[PDB]
Design a protein around this ligand. Structure first.
Ligand SMILES: [Cl-]
Ligand SMILES: [La+3]
Ligand SMILES: [La+3]
Ligand SMILES: [La+3]
Ligand SMILES: [La+3]
Length: 109
């Protein structure tokens, strides 16, 4: 997968299975189960760059909605409500988008 050399396949499978059900996504539980919580800035930056599909330098709402699909193309979209909670949690400064430092801070909360 896209995170070979950074994350563990079994962990990714597990993190996806934990949020298969509609409404069940929880970034804290996802980040801990997927193994991201203890990764270095360099690794977090690489992950961030994958999620930032359009290289805008920020993860915007549209990219957050498709967050899971970076891990598996077959994964579901997040609901609008899931996406909003995720954005609110990540976007420390409230400017509407998530930068790499905000992304790392949410992970290491
Ligand atoms: Cl969340
Ligand atoms: La972007
Ligand atoms: La730029
Ligand atoms: La922000
Ligand atoms: La800002």
């Amino acid at each position: 997968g896209a995170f070979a050399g950074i994350l563990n396949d079994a962990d990714i499978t597990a993190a996806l299975a934990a949020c298969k059900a509609e409404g069940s996504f929880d970034h804290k539980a996802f980040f801990t189960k997927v193994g991201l919580a203890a990764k270095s800035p360099a690794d977090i930056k690489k992950v961030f760059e994958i999620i930032d599909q359009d290289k805008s330098d920020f993860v915007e709402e549209d990219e957050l909605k498709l967050f899971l699909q970076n891990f598996s193309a077959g994964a579901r979209a997040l609901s609008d409500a899931e996406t909003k909670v995720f954005l609110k949690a990540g976007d420390s400064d409230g400017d509407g988008k998530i930068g790499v430092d905000e992304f790392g801070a949410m992970i290491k909360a």
